[PDB]
RNA sequence: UACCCGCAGAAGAAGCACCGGCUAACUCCGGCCAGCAGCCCGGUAAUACGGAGGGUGCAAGCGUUAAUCGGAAUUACUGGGCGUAAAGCGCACGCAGGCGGUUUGUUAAGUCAGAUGUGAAAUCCCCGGGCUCAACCUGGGAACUGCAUCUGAUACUGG
RNA sequence: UUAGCUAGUAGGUGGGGUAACGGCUCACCUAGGCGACGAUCCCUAGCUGGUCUGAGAGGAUGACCAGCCACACUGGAACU
């Protein structure tokens, strides 16, 4: 009962010796909405057939994020190509101040509260990458608190 | 010569005046020393209008500053009531 | 830049040139028609775009804009123009259509506040 | 030239660990034994040694947890080029508190939280995240 | 106990003054970076004792010229 | 200041009943609900992100009869307020005075509600206030004036208001046609189909 | 005068912009002309011109123009770059300037801590009060992120 | 795309002058003073609490209200 996501469909195109051939891409995400997220993008010659592909490569493919309580553990950086992300962690009631694409993202991974900022190029596919990346380099207490072989009295 | 008086603040046909310490040259609602209390003119006897400090007052006129009369009839019923 | 070469020279925030310097920061300006003609627009259009040169009361000469279908304007006419440029290279303004001049354009029943048009009266 | 030891003890530190070297090697000094304790007490790092008398080697033992970095971060914040000096009320949290900055306070070098509670500032040395 | 400052002093050439620069660390309002500023003030030197290079401490005062408003107070390093 | 034209259109667009009639019959037999309105209404083409938001925000505006000042100020003070701003939205709207006279059973719609509380015919703690907007607190008595309680608009609309159901913060007595302001209501009291995150994120872009 | 009371009768009181995308809102009718255009239509079935019907958004207002900031991380201190997109001086020596290996002692200038004085009132923000509500007025507080002085700290920078 | 500026100019002694210190003024003597941390020159401009905007840092701004300054047809001057 996971929550599906179409983000951005866009119309490319490559040229053969007739003409040009249009074929569709469509960028969605899933995720079930307590800290697991996923992203698929699937080309096709035709939508729906391109949503489809987007969601089974979606459906798969999908990371752990480690939630607290329905925000982000701290601020957090996500870089792809162009795109450069700031995630920060809000308090309750604020909700999600985020771009499209980081908006739909963060609110199927489970994220209730942020204060999201897009840097460089908002393209869609980097912007989606790099809050993924984002979000899957977050740690938690736990994590840094057993990594660093004592106990977790820093939370 | 330095004066208490009155500084009219408020609305329009709702006033409400600060009694302030200035000299007396300063414009009504210009420049002044120490702020000494308030008086609510329209007040609804519920609540409370008339706050002036009475001991910077004595203060001030023990230097020689003046009381204007609306100033003195305040300072009067503040200490009949209280 | 290095945090010295910053303390020695600061940034130096781009300053933004107007796109109506005629009007030097006022809504509208007045001015008297010199010449009124007509212009054909820039390659991909095709038309023949009513205009007309308006030395301003500031001493600046602009060619303005005539909004609408018809209009009677003359040399010597003293209207009143608007920022507002048309994408006809050279022409940056607008003429404000029921404005002590410039009739509004008649048989207008939509966007008649844009013309200068009185409500028709049922 | 070496203008900067102690952001060359930091890149030492992030380059062995980048390259998962067991232990780092460089020249010794006060501020970087100083420093050195703060991390080993705090758990970035294993254990750390001085040894040499007139040129003291400074090394220190990188720790890793799941074949991975345990030192994820680590920044100079006050550089000569740029001083930062932060008072009580404004000492930096890395990581929203879960990581440390390293912070040089009138009473020794210490952590934020340590200089927090002690109601110290001065001078951030670096961010361990 | 009195509010003073200190200085070297870059000229003696006139009669009973001289000229103190006070150096002071500033940080930058913006960048944040820590810059020298120097403060020249015109000494009233009485005895002609300060010479260039000394490290002086002076005090403020009436004014005793068009520019001249602070007086010496002692030398601390002289000259060497 | 004021919605005056067809009420039954405001639902039809926004495809949910809006309570703009009495209730004397179904809206459904006195108009197209499924259907939006104008001629171009049997198609339903795909909203935007932006066509969502501003349709929760028009849905609730148009429940309570609130213009867009008025529901800027209500935001504006209700992201000022601690807490939620979302319940704080919904709270501030509910404790408008023809709102609660409506929800009091004087009004069988919100317009002839305010119809009542303008024409100087409903007291405040047995002060006559005639402000739509009035904040009303918890403990107030809201009443009926002595003039009005002979009116039988106010006997049909008492009828009408125990045919529907009655609301936990209002205590109100039909034969003194008087009722007391309680409390103002928590989220989970009010209707469960209003979205107001997406009111805040419409208001917050 | 505010406010209150009585009379009569829906009676005296709704407009402006927009509907190709950005951007909520679609159909009919009249030839790259007339015209629209904030940035990317019209050459004879134009949701883009003009009119009508319908709808959308505001509403005693509605639009256009002018102006500032934001978005613009698009002067990047927070917070950008320079192989090919704009950007490494043709190369070097070198004064002023910027920065500077390591240990000890000392100073306490930078730095940090505490206290005092000041930082006018209004304004901003918080809890209340009075105007039938609001705007508005107002009590108290917080704030005024600053400067100076005095007393200490000595890790780092400086002498 | 303004680099040199300054002769009462900088300082000292003495006389005068002011309610008051002071080249404020005068006589004489010394030869200095300002400046690359931007002197000099040119253009623009009342300053502040504050206002608008901004998450903030900043950017823009200085109408109303309050404090300070300057002016009173233009230039000069003193009297009470």
Redesign the pocket.
Do not use: W
């Given at each position: 009962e996971l929550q599906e996501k179409l983000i951005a469909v866009n119309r490319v195109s490559k040229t053969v010796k007739g003409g040009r051939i249009f074929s569709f891409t469509a960028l969605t995400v899933v995720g079930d909405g307590n800290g697991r997220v996923g992203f698929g993008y699937g080309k096709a010659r035709e939508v729906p057939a391109a949503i489809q592909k987007a969601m089974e490569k979606a459906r798969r493919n999908m990371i752990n994020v480690a939630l607290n309580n329905g925000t982000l553990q701290h601020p957090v950086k996500g870089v792809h190509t162009g795109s450069?992300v700031?995630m920060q962690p809000a308090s309750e009631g604020t909700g999600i101040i985020a771009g499209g694409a980081m908006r739909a993202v963060l609110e199927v991974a489970g994220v209730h509260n942020v204060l999201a900022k897009a840097?460089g190029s908002t393209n869609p596919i980097n912007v989606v990458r790099a809050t993924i990346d984002g979000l899957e380099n977050m740690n938690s207490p736990e994590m840094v608190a057993a990594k660093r072989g004592k106990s977790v009295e820093e939370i | 010569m330095v004066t208490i008086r009155l500084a009219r603040?408020?609305?329009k046909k709702?006033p409400?005046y600060?009694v302030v310490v200035a000299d007396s040259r300063?414009?009504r609602?210009?420049?002044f020393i120490e702020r000494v209390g308030?008086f609510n003119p329209i007040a609804?006897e519920?609540?409370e209008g008339t706050?002036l400090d009475l001991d910077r007052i004595a203060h001030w006129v023990g230097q020689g500053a003046t009381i204007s009369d609306r100033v003195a009839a305040l300072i009067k019923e503040v200490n009949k009531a209280a | 830049?290095t945090?010295?070469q910053?303390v020695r020279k600061p940034?130096?925030?781009?300053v933004?040139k107007?796109?109506?310097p005629a009007?030097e920061?006022?809504?509208?300006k007045r001015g008297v028609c010199t010449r009124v003609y007509t212009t054909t627009?820039k390659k991909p259009?095709?038309?023949?775009?009513?205009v007309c040169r308006v030395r301003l009361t500031n001493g600046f000469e602009v060619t303005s804009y005539i909004?609408?279908?018809?209009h009677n304007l003359q040399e010597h006419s003293v209207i009143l123009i608007?920022?507002?440029?048309?994408?006809?290279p050279g022409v940056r303004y607008h003429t404000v259509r029921g404005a002590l001049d410039c009739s509004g354009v008649k048989?207008?029943?939509?966007?008649?506040?844009?013309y200068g048009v009185k409500?028709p009266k049922a | 030239?070496?203008?900067?030891?102690i952001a060359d003890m930091l890149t030492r530190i992030r380059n062995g660990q980048a390259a998962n070297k067991a232990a780092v090697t460089m020249?010794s000094?006060?501020?970087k034994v100083?420093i050195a304790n703060v991390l080993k007490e705090e758990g970035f790092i294993e254990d750390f040694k001085v040894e040499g008398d007139t040129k003291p080697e400074l090394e220190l033992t990188l720790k890793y947890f799941q074949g991975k970095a345990v030192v994820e971060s680590i920044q100079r914040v006050s550089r000569?080029?740029l001083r930062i000096?932060?008072?009580?009320?404004e000492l930096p949290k890395v990581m929203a508190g879960l990581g440390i900055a390293v912070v040089?306070?009138?009473?020794?070098?210490m952590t934020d939280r340590a200089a927090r509670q002690a109601?110290?500032?001065?001078?951030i040395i670096c961010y361990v995240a | 106990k009195i509010?003073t400052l200190q200085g070297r002093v870059v000229?003696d050439?006139?009669?009973?003054?001289i000229?103190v620069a006070i150096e002071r660390?500033v940080?930058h309002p913006?960048?944040?970076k820590?810059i020298?500023?120097?403060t020249?003030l015109?000494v009233?030197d009485e005895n002609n004792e300060c010479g260039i290079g000394d490290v002086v401490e002076i005090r403020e005062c009436?004014?005793?010229?068009?520019?001249?408003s602070w007086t010496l107070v002692r030398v601390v390093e002289k000259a060497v | 200041?004021r919605?005056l034209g067809p009420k039954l259109?405001l639902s039809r667009?926004e495809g949910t009943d809006l309570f703009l009639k009495s209730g004397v019959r179904a809206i459904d037999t006195k108009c197209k609900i499924e259907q939006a309105?104008?001629?171009?209404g049997a198609?339903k083409?795909r909203?935007?992100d932006?066509?969502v938001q501003?349709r929760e925000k028009?849905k609730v505006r148009r429940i309570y009869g609130v213009?867009?000042?008025q529901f800027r100020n209500y935001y504006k003070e209700a992201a000022?307020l601690?807490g939620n701003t979302g319940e704080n939205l919904l709270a501030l709207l509910e404790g408008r005075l023809d709102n609660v006279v409506y929800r009091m059973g004087f009004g069988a719609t919100r317009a002839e509600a305010r119809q009542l509380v303008s024409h100087?015919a409903i007291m405040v703690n047995g002060?006559?206030?005639?402000?739509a907007?009035?904040?009303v607190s918890p403990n107030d008595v809201v009443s009926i004036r002595e003039?009005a309680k002979k009116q039988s608009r106010v006997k049909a609309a008492l009828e009408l208001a125990e045919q529907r159901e009655k609301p936990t913060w209002l205590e109100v007595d039909a034969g003194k046609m008087e009722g007391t302001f309680k409390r103002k209501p928590e989220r989970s009291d009010l209707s469960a189909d209003i979205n107001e995150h997406l009111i805040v994120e419409l208001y917050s872009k």
């Open positions: 450069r700031f840097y | 603040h408020g609305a709702r409400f600060q300063n414009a609602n210009g420049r308030f609804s519920k609540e706050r | 830049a945090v010295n910053l940034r130096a925030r781009k933004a107007s796109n109506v009007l920061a006022c809504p509208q627009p259009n095709s038309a023949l775009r009513k909004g609408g279908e018809g608007r920022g507002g440029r048309v994408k006809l048989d207008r029943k939509q966007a008649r506040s844009k409500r | 030239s070496m203008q900067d030891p020249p000094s006060k501020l100083a000569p080029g000096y932060k008072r009580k009320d040089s306070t009138s009473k020794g070098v109601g110290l500032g001065g001078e | 509010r000229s050439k006139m009669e009973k003054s000229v660390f940080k913006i960048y944040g820590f020298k500023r120097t020249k015109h009233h009436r004014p005793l010229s068009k520019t001249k | 200041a919605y259109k667009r309105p104008g001629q171009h198609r083409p909203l935007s932006y066509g501003l028009q213009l867009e000042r000022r601690k100087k002060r006559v206030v005639n402000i907007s009035y904040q003039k």
